[PDB]
Amino acid sequence: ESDSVEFNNAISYVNKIKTRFLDHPEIYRSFLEILHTYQKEQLHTKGRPFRGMSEEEVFTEVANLFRGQEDLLSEFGQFLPEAKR
């Protein structure tokens, strides 16, 4: 992974977010907190052994984060476990 093509899809997604919410730094960060929280769910080392945040409720805040940016909400399906789709 010198050239991370899959990562570039992720980066384009993120860079676009950066720009699209360039005037609104909080939204960028609100999303980051979801993905950060999402990671604490995916790992077994977490606050409490429980299945916290399910993908659909994850997507809920993410869709809510970028309400109006359907592109981002659609590319998120590629950033997510594509194997499910």
Residues 6+ apart with CB under 8 A from 77: 85
Q: How many domains, in total, are found in the chain?
A: 1
Give the HSE-up count for residue 26: Cα atoms under 13 Å, Cβ half-sphere: 0
Sorted by sequence, the CB contacts under 8 Å of residue 18 that are 6+ apart come out as: 28
* Phi–psi pair at 28, nearest 5 degrees: -60, -45
Distance CA(13)–CA(65), nearest Å, equals: 13
Q: Please count the CA atoms within 13 angstroms of the CA of 40 that sit on its side-chain side.
A: 11
Domain that holds residue 56: 1-85
CATH code, domain with 44: 1.20.1160.11
Method: NMR
Q: What angle separates helix 5-20 from helix 70-79, to the nearest 10 degrees?
A: 150
